[PDB]
Design a protein around this ligand. Structure first.
Ligand SMILES: [Mg+2]
Ligand SMILES: [Zn+2]
Lengths: 1322, 653
DNA sequence: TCATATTATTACGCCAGACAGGG
DNA sequence: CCCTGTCTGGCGTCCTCTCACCTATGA
RNA sequence: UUGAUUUGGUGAGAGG
């Protein structure tokens, strides 16, 4: 079964693997994020409720008043989106917050407040999101791009080689909070442990332990295990668990139980450890040279004399043993400092530490953090207890606590946001374990260690900044609060929240201007994952590995769609199937594989879960049950693509598109292209201009439908049904009854956006693709947008291309084009330019909008009214006048009248004017007022009458259970209708019910039309300051010409060189010329062989189209057409499509065959595409030669090209790098102010920067005079250039050079220091 | 200056000076009022920091800022940096009489001229047109002429063709790296908006036609027109200054047209017929009686100039093809016939132009470079040399090679389950057998492409080199190598992960067969690393050129002989393999220090101050001379410069 | 409108060049 | 006193094109 | 004597 615009032109779909999961809604990142931001979500997470439950209730410092929260709301926007783009306002909503002030008496923590007050106060306006994922910030339509940043939680990084210049590795460990202070631990090459906070000075790390109220003995209890020396019969024996001897040299005689176990000299092996454990060896008598290097663990004091023997962490000598042995401390605890495993890093750090107690530790930390200003007990304790341990200024989020517990192998995943003692101690223990050998480092490119911020998270963080500023303001006003004479807007202020949130949505590194020239380009700028932005890395610094593709990108980030240039691999684009995790990570779908049978259930994984499992490949042959048909299958285990068994796998890839994105999965035959040319192909495919006549890629991938629907450029039907099709203004859809609400009778009226300006000066235009009285279903398309054709996606157009050298005109990458391409207007794109004119009151009175243009004669008053401003629509070019806008006292009058820029033509399509309340010239301002005034009422009544007509009929329709008397129901016409009483019978309240409808309709229409006139009757609506605001919309129509840039989908760039006549083209023996000749020499080097298979398969597609065009032109009854269409849709191997063609009612075969006579469209999916034998077999169904190559004659000489050439249909696109936006020349005009050199650019009429390497190139020749005029006369020296212009126009090519002006600018800037630079003797 | 609006966008120096003056006024008032010590110490300290911030901002602790957090730019920051006065306004300036547009080909050009649009030509040459209009007498005042060219009447285009005619322009591609990136042409006017640029010259500019742009500059004065014609003209730059190699080498279409033209096949139309000249060879090709490659005895008359500047004719019958005679109609007089008798790839056509330049000089080499380009484009058009899907011939032996490699990795992993071998030796054995299988697949496809054609002539079969399209694009050296044609037919090797180590499972599928998902992802590892390397490598390459031209910067050839006898000892370099760079590459065109003894005994073979051009180097190679003591630039005795002998040959002259 | 005058983030990679520390 | 980690400054590609956004205060 | 403001500076994106 198919929908009704699916039976229009059903694309022949190759593809063997049955898809199990359909493509998700391609704009779901932006929409789900911002729907999380604004939503009334009780339990607080996440959203605006999290912000209000963090900041509220505010209580002041015992001020006995506590403003609390109830509920918030967003009212209607005062401007809908279209008039918002027209006017220039933000597309925002007012944020109505209920606030409840309660005020206490004296001594009321528990006492009832003395008075309350509560109001729906107004703070800020937040910009809402349009239904397509965009904002409208100041008239322009912008997009917030999702950031990719390091997750909160600990990271164990190495930096193995570069420091110390000695090959000794370090190991640092960064505890990155979501909000607050950064804490880093790091080794130094003396093997000492150092802490630093916020990249400040370096403190030896155990001082932070001494800041957490840990004595030295507790620290040594933590990071070291005790070795027990017992004072015994002789020589102070040792408890020895045999694990501690692993891998060391036996220094002494190892004997016990009257038996010599291990002698001196040999290293202790694990067999000797087994001997000591089997022989149960713990207590052995040591020599005195064994204890002479060890370190004591805890303190010991001489008991009778009452003083200290040794401090904790003290190495032992023999006389120290003579001190402690004679006192009476029988147990001696020593620190086991294994040189292999258990290193003495904490102990040597304690030897570096200049502190001894907690208080000096806090004083040293306070002298680190805030220097100069003294370190007192209260100040240092408040500093360190609010560094990490308070809920205000340090907060690992839920993501941070999950990563923090996961990297430390904790059991739980939810905990408190602040740190604790045990967390810092665990980070130090894991860092020490990594130094010892056990456990390993983390990498930073691993996408399980890399979170995504999106629109709702970033706007929530900015909103929380605004709320903490307004709570500091509320704490300010409340302690100065006098009661009861204030209500909660003398306390609260709508200014900082609105200021912060407009600061982010206006001027941020991620709220950026939408690339809008293409449905693809909109939908792939919204799905963008940037590494840049605040808190992330920069373009000009880093690096090599963060610009590189890591094995966790499989199915999360597109490997091949990243922009080439200064930021490669920072501006990654998101994959097709990849959602976003609850915590913000990238989870991608996989198919759960319990046993041999691959189950059709899906299950989402992130990269910290994808490593543990074994995940199969998308294309591994499985037949009729899910069993892998091989006994071994390529999978990947832990980022390593390897071959595993038939029955080990736990997951399989869902579909074979899932590695790449929606820009580079529209490229058919992707798997045959090179990676570089697929990158260049996707990046150019974003840049296509919408042509005037949209044309359906013959070789597509089938993802055109999802991109053209999911990007909101087409008018997808909301509720299904039929159609009324007024359409000149709007599509009117009558709704079928099942999808139709009981009240609100209701028919859907779709607004078509006709010719208007895009963000890239292209033309966004919608055209209805459904006729009158034609069924449509829910989700079906109704109006084709820019670059769409019946709901598909038509960026460029499909043309007949020959691969051959043709007389040098396609030399390096150039492209030689027939005249049949430029006669048919099949690339003639439409550009629209907005031009503003304002008459601001700079000085010496205000400027004026009058045709009475001066000095200039009857060459001003022409394309305008009898007395001012461009009329409506003519063929204006360059140097014309659009808006007469000149002042007197500015003879002394002048010409600021905004004219048409140099080189452009066009038609004035629209003139907008919300000017300084007064613009009316003669009486036009109020003349149109009456026109709109009468317009509103007309439609208002019309619509009511339209429904009235439907209701009147409905009244009679229902009039059967309570008066069906046809001859007794046609009484009053426009007066009443029902003069009976149904009462009940079988409930037809229905008459009374419909009576209310009409009664309310007229009653509401009056009020509806009442406000209409009110709105109509007005000067105009805009902001203040600016006075004369005239915007004129030109529309140039640019065709194609030698110098434009065209390109296919594979990376084959080209500058169209010669626009040949039709005759000189290479025609085949049938007679048709070829349209575009490309060059075969690009194909062996640039290894993008997919354009040839697209060429052959498009040739086969148009072969079927020519065959259907013959069978339908030379008209046959529909049996032969349905037989040939059925053969065309069966065609070859096992596919997914076949068709159910004998259910197309003998007319939907014919409408399909009317839409196929330009070529049968073929879906070649991304990595499961059409094989070559099917291309040959399809070329045999059409009557074309199997090789794909036709013999071609030459249009010049009439004689055959030897060795037959390739002709086919490639889908070639016109990129928006047009040659009459690049052509520029300058002889003489205006310059800058500071310098005497020419200005730069094209919009400024400026000259070429003759840069540094060109000066070196002229020095490389003997061009001393060319360089002398190149930097003195042509550029800078003012006397030289005026003398040169007069010398040229006299006929004397001679320069009088002088000295450059910018060098005298250099002399004054150097001399304006204390520097006396001069110019010496003659 | 105010921007568009009603406020003044003020500079940063006005903030700095206004703060110094505010603080200085405060300090004068406090020294009037006799404030105490700590007040005037803070006041003078704030003045000290204000002055120090004005002069060089940010050299003291964190720099001051106005809007918003960005520091404001001081005087020293108007001098230093990439955007100071030296690097931004004094070494490089913006320039009047200049233009810029997208380039395109136009292959009808001669290599001293380029196409230049009419709209750019009327804008760049406004003062010359004004002077011409005022000379004729059509108008009077200057205003009238500016109205005439603002209206663009019917008479200013003849004025424009009379100001263009002998007036060169400097075309310049935007990343100019060496001196061949600024070359002077003569304009030919173009209906259009794109600069038509002669194709051979593109290999000098590194200019393809994928969207490139070039700037045009006009030499205004008369000495600059003469410098553009006599030093910077495109006919004058036919040798690269880095070496002796020609830079007007025919690049890609034209070598395919020649390689298809001068070749042969074992049977064609007109096999083994005899022809009385090259003129009727082209007449037999055009009428349709022979083929472009059909072996044939012709009678050619080659002019060998064996006397002292006299050209002696020798005519003979060469067993050659039809295409070699047609290409002999374009070769100038002095070159022998054996320069076209071979197959003419790209190295052979480069040494054809090089031998033409060494024998017949400059003007026949310019006109012969143009005739090469014209006949290459014309017969490449007549060739119809496409590319198909059938041209990439899969080896029939490829699948059995892959199965033998799969059996070998199966044996190695069965040893790995039983622990007989180590892990590093396993990884080494797997990379070794996949390298061996890769080389065998490449040899299978290379035999299957280089001799696939087997056509009979009058009897049994006989083999020859193939006319496969991708093989001529590879063998001609137009575009393609062994590796790229290997990746389109044989397996595309063992791609490496970004860890730097190789991956033990290769990409056994080429591009004609489909890559599956994992193989394309490993390919994307290997290609993303290359794009990141180029896009970050270019910064270090440019900064290296900057440091080199600023250490050089001064050194000018300023004498004719320093009068020394010292110079470095040029030997051929040998690393331990076969002799890498011969002595004729190192002592070509460098003046000897003392006179080289002939290797027999004590003979004056060459004198002690002779430039060693090609004739001297051939008389050095005949005598097998050991090593030459030659004069080097580092031994030059000239104060402030390098003498003319210790440099050497001009290299492009 | 017309003078008043500066604070609560961190996440480059060498590579010279100068400086306090210690055998 | 001669090595030495450690800290501080100083580099980091040319040319071009499009768009938006610009200090608070205040009797 | 017959006319006028971006360069300034930031941010974002793009081409070769
Ligand atoms: Mg290029
Ligand atoms: Zn010398």
């Amino acid at each position: 079964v198919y929908s009704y615009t699916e039976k229009k032109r059903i694309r022949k779909d190759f593809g063997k693997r049955p898809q199990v999961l359909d493509v998700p809604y391609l704009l779901s990142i932006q929409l789900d994020s911002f729907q999380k931001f604004i939503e009334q979500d009780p339990e607080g997470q996440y959203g605006l409720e999290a912000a209000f439950r963090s900041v509220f209730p505010i209580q002041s410092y015992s001020g006995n008043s506590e403003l609390q929260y109830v509920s918030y709301r967003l009212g209607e926007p005062v401007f809908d989106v279209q008039e918002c783009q027209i006017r220039g306002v933000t597309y925002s909503a007012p944020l109505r917050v209920k606030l409840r002030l309660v005020i206490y008496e004296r001594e009321a923590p528990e006492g009832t407040v003395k008075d309350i007050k509560e109001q729906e106060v107004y703070m800020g306006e937040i910009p809402l999101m349009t239904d397509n994922g965009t904002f409208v910030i100041n008239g322009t339509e912008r997009v917030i791009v999702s950031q990719l940043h390091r997750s909160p939680g600990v990271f164990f990084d190495s930096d193995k080689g570069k420091t110390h210049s000695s090959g000794k590795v370090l190991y640092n460990a960064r505890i990155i909070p979501y909000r607050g202070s950064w804490l880093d631990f790091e080794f130094d090459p003396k093997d000492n442990l150092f802490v630093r906070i916020d990249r400040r000075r370096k403190l030896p790390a155990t001082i932070i332990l001494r800041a957490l109220n840990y004595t030295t003995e507790q620290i040594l209890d933590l990071f070291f295990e005790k070795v027990i020396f017992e004072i015994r019969d002789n020589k102070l024996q040792m408890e020895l668990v045999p694990e501690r001897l692993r891998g060391e040299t036996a220094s002494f005689d190892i004997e016990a139980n009257g038996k010599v176990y291990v002698e001196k000299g040999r290293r202790i092996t694990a067999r000797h450890i087994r001997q000591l454990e089997k022989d149960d060896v713990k207590l052995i008598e040591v020599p005195v040279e064994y204890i002479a290097g060890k370190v004591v663990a805890k303190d010991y004091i001489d008991e009778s004399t009452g003083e200290l023997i040794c401090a904790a962490n003290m190495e032992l000598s023999l006389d120290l043993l003579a001190k402690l042995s004679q006192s009476g401390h029988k147990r001696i605890e020593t620190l086991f400092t294994n040189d292999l495993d258990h290193g003495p890093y904490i102990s040597e750090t304690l030897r570096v530490d200049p502190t001894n107690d907690r208080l000096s530790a806090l004083v040293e930390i306070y002298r680190m953090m805030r220097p100069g200003e003294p370190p007192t007990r209260e100040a240092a304790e408040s500093l360190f207890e609010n560094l990490f341990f308070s809920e205000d200024r340090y907060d690992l989020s839920a993501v941070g606590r999950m990563k923090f517990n996961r990297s430390l192998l904790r059991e739980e995943i939810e905990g408190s946001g602040i740190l604790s003692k045990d967390d810092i101690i665990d980070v130090m223990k894991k860092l020490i374990d990594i130094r010892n050998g056990k456990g390993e480092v983390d990498d930073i490119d691993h996408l399980g260690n890399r979170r995504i911020r999106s629109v709702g998270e970033m706007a929530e963080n900015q909103f929380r900044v605004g709320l903490v500023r307004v709570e500091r303001a509320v704490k300010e006003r409340l302690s100065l609060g006098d009661l009861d004479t204030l209500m909660p807007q003398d306390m609260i202020n709508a200014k900082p929240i609105s200021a912060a949130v407009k600061e982010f949505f206006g001027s941020s590194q991620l709220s950026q201007f939408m690339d809008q020239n293409n449905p693809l380009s909109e939908i792939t700028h919204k799905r963008r994952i940037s590494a840049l932005g605040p808190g992330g890395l920069t373009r000009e610094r880093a690096g090599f590995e963060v610009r590189d593709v890591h094995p966790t990108h499989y199915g999360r980030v597109c490997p091949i769609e990243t922009p080439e240039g200064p930021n490669i691999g920072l501006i990654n684009s998101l994959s097709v199937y990849a959602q976003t995790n609850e915590y913000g990570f990238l989870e991608t779908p996989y198919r759960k594989v319990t046993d041999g049978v691959v189950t059709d259930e899906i299950h989402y994984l992130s990269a910290i879960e994808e490593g543990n499992y074994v995940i199969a490949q998308a294309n591994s042959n499985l037949d009729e049950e899910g069993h892998f048909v091989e006994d071994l299958v390529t999978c990947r285990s832990k980022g390593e693509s390897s071959l595993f068994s038939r029955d080990q796998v736990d997951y399989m890839d869902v579909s074979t598109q899932q590695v790449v994105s929606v820009g580079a999965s529209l490229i058919p035959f992707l798997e045959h292209d090179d990676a570089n040319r697929a990158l260049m192909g996707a990046n150019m495919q974003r840049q296509a201009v919408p042509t005037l006549r949209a044309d359906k890629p013959l070789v597509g991938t089938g993802m055109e439908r999802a991109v053209a629907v999911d990007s909101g450029v087409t008018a997808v039907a909301k509720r299904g049904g039929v159609v009324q099709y007024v359409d000149a203004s709007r599509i009117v859809i009558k709704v079928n009854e099942d999808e139709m609400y009981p009240g609100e009778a209701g028919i859907d009226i779709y607004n078509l956006t006709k010719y208007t300006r895009s963000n890239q000066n292209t033309c966004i235009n919608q055209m209805p693709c459904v006729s009158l009285g034609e069924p449509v279903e829910r989700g079906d398309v109704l109006a084709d947008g820019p670059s769409t054709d019946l709901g598909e996606l038509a960026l460029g157009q499909n043309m007949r291309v020959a691969f051959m050298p043709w007389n040098g005109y396609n030399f390096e990458d150039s492209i030689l084009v027939s005249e049949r391409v430029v006669q048919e207007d099949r690339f003639t794109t439409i550009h629209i330019q907005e031009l503003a004119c304002v008459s601001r009151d700079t000085k010496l009175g205000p400027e004026e909008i009058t045709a009475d243009i001066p000095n200039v004669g009857e060459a001003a008053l022409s394309k305008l009214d009898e007395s001012g401003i461009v009329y409506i629509g003519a063929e204006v070019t360059g140097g014309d006048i659009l808006v007469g806008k000149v002042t007197p006292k500015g003879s002394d009058v002048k010409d600021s009248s905004l004219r048409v820029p140099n080189g452009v033509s066009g038609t004035v399509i629209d003139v907008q004017v919300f000017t300084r309340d007064g613009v009316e010239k003669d009486k036009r301002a109020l003349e149109i007022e009456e026109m709109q005034l009468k317009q509103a009422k007309k439609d208002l009544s019309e619509e009511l009458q339209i429904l009235e007509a439907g209701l009147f009929s409905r009244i009679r329709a229902v009039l059967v259970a309570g008066g069906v008397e046809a001859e007794k129901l046609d009484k009053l016409p426009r007066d009443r209708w029902l003069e009976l009483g149904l009462t009940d019978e079988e409930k037809q309240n229905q008459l009374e019910q419909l009576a209310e409808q009409y009664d309310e309709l007229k009653h509401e229409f009056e009020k509806k039309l009442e406000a209409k006139r009110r709105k109509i009757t007005q000067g105009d609506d805009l902001a203040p300051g600016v006075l004369k605001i005239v915007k004129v919309y030109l529309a140039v129509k640019r065709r194609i010409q030698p110098g434009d840039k065209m390109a296919g989908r594979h990376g084959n760039k080209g500058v169209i060189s010669k626009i040949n006549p039709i005759e000189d083209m290479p025609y085949d023996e049938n007679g048709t010329p070829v349209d575009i000749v490309l060059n075969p020499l690009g194909v062996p080097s640039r290894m993008n062989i997919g354009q040839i298979l697209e060429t052959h398969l498009g040739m086969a597609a148009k072969g079927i189209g020519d065959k259907i065009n013959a069978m339908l032109k030379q008209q046959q009854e529909v049996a032969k057409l349905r037989e040939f269409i059925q053969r065309a849709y069966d065609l070859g191997a096992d596919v997914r499509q076949k068709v159910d063609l004998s259910t197309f009612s003998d007319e939907e075969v014919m409408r399909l065959a009317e839409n196929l006579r330009k070529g049968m469209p073929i879906a070649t999916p991304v990595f499961d595409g059409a094989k070559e034998a099917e291309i040959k077999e399809l070329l045999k169904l059409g009557d074309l030669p199997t090789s794909g190559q036709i013999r071609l004659y030459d249009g010049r000489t009439g004689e055959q090209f030897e060795r037959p050439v390739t002709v086919g249909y490639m889908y070639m696109l016109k990129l928006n790098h047009l040659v009459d936006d690049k052509m520029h020349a300058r002889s003489t005009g205006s310059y800058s102010l500071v310098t005497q050199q020419p200005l730069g650019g094209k919009a400024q009429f400026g000259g070429q920067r003759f840069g540094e390497m060109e000066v070196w190139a002229l020095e490389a020749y003997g061009a001393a005079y060319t360089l002398q005029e190149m930097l003195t006369v042509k550029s800078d020296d003012v006397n030289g250039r005026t003398k040169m212009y007069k010398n040229i126009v006299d006929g004397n090519h001679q320069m009088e050079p002088g000295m450059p002006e910018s060098f005298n600018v250099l002399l004054k800037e150097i001399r304006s220091l204390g520097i006396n630079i001069e110019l010496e003797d003659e | 200056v105010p921007l568009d609006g009603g406020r003044f966008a003020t500079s940063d120096l006005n903030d700095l000076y206004r703060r110094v003056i505010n603080r200085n006024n405060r300090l004068k008032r406090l020294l009037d009022l006799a404030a105490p010590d700590i007040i005037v110490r803070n006041e003078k300290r704030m003045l000290q920091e204000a002055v120090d911030a004005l002069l060089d901002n940010g050299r003291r602790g964190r720099a001051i800022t106005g809007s918003n957090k960005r520091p404001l730019k001081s005087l020293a920051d108007m001098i230093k940096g990439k955007q100071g006065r030296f690097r931004q306004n004094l070494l490089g300036k913006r320039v009047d009489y200049s233009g810029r547009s997208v380039i395109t080909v136009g292959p009808y050009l001669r290599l001293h001229q380029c196409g230049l649009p009419k709209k750019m030509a009327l804008e760049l040459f406004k003062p010359f047109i004004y002077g011409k209009l005022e000379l004729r007498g059509l108008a009077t005042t200057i205003k009238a002429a500016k109205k005439m060219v603002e209206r663009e009447e019917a008479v200013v285009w003849d004025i424009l063709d009379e100001v263009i005619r002998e007036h060169p322009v400097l075309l310049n591609r935007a990343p100019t790296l060496h001196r061949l990136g600024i070359q002077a042409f003569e304009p030919v006017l173009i209906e259009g908006k794109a600069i038509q640029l002669h194709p051979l010259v593109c290999a000098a500019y590194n200019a393809d036609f994928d969207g490139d742009q070039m700037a045009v500059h006009v030499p205004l004065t008369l000495e600059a027109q003469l410098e553009a014609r006599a030093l910077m003209m495109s006919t004058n730059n036919i040798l690269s200054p880095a070496n002796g190699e020609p830079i007007i080498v025919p690049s890609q279409d034209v070598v395919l047209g020649l390689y298809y033209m001068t070749r042969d096949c074992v049977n064609a139309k007109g096999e083994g017929m005899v022809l009385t000249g090259p003129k009727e060879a082209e007449r037999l090709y055009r009428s349709g009686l022979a083929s472009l490659h059909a072996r044939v005895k012709v009678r050619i008359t080659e002019y060998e100039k064996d006397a002292n500047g006299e050209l002696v004719a020798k005519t003979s019958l060469k067993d050659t093809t039809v295409g070699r005679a047609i290409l002999w109609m374009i070769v100038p007089k002095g070159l022998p016939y054996s320069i076209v008798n071979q197959a003419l790839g790209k190295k052979a056509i480069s040494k054809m132009l090089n031998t033409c330049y060494r024998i017949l000089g400059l003007k026949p080499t310019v006109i012969f470079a143009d005739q090469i380009m014209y006949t290459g484009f014309a017969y490449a058009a007549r060739s119809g040399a496409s590319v198909g899907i059938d041209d990439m011939v899969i080896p029939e032996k490829k699948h059995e090679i892959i199965s033998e490699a799969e059996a070998e990795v199966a044996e190695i992993q069965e040893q790995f389950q039983s622990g007989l071998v180590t892990a590093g030796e396993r990884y080494n054995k797997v990379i070794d057998i996949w390298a061996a299988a890769n080389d065998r697949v490449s040899k299978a496809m290379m035999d299957n492409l280089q001799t696939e054609t087997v056509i009979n002539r009058d009897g049994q079969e006989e083999k020859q080199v193939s006319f496969n399209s991708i093989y001529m694009m590879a063998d001609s050296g137009a575009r393609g190598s062994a590796a790229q044609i290997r990746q389109l037919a044989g397996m595309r090797g063992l791609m490496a992960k970004p860890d730097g180590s190789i991956i033990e499972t290769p990409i056994t599928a080429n591009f004609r067969e489909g890559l599956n998902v994992l193989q394309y992802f490993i390919s994307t590892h290997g290609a993303r690393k290359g794009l990141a390397d180029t896009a970050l490598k270019t910064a270090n390459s440019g900064y290296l050129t900057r440091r080199l031209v600023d250490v050089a910067q001064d050194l000018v050839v300023t004498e004719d002989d320093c009068g020394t006898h010292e110079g470095i000892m040029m030997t051929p370099v040998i690393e331990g393999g076969d002799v890498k760079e011969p002595l004729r590459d190192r002592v070509l065109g460098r003046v000897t220090a003392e006179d080289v003894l002939k290797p027999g005994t004590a003979d004056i073979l060459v004198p002690r101050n002779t430039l060693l051009h090609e004739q001297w180097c051939d008389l050095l190679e005949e005598n097998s001379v050991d090593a030459v003591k030659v004069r080097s630039v580092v031994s030059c005795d000239t104060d402030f410069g390098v003498c003319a002998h210790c440099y050497g040959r001009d290299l492009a002259r």
